[PDB]
Amino acid sequence: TVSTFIDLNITMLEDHEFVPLEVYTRHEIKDSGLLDYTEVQRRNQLHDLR
Amino acid sequence: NCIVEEVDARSVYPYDEFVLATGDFVYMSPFYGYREGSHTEHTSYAADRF
């Protein structure tokens, strides 16, 4: 068999899922400061009851 | 000198203590009381003070 047809190949672009990605979370940013003022306050205001 | 002063208050989860605009930690849930299991809430204070 010979053919008079001209081929053409089209495959659909497959699905692709995007997972959530973060370089730094806000908890790491809150921990970036050398002294979280709030936690220092809460610790130091327990001295009499401790 | 007697001083009466209105201030804001901020508590984070679990809300067993809060702060004030001056920066004073009150070691008691803002919802601790006497009505509907409010004595379940947390207060590290002697019950006579509240």
Ligand SMILES: *[C@@H]1O[C@H](CO)[C@@H](O[C@@H]2O[C@H](CO)[C@@H](O)[C@H](O)[C@H]2NC(C)=O)[C@H](O)[C@H]1NC(C)=O
């Ligand atoms: C039509 O579709 C593609 C080319 O776009 C070819 O399919 C892939 O071919 C590669 C090798 O080139 C295989 O490893 C893969 O298994 C094939 N499928 C996919 C989804 O990649 C296919 O061969 C083309 N048709 C012809 C007749 O070549």
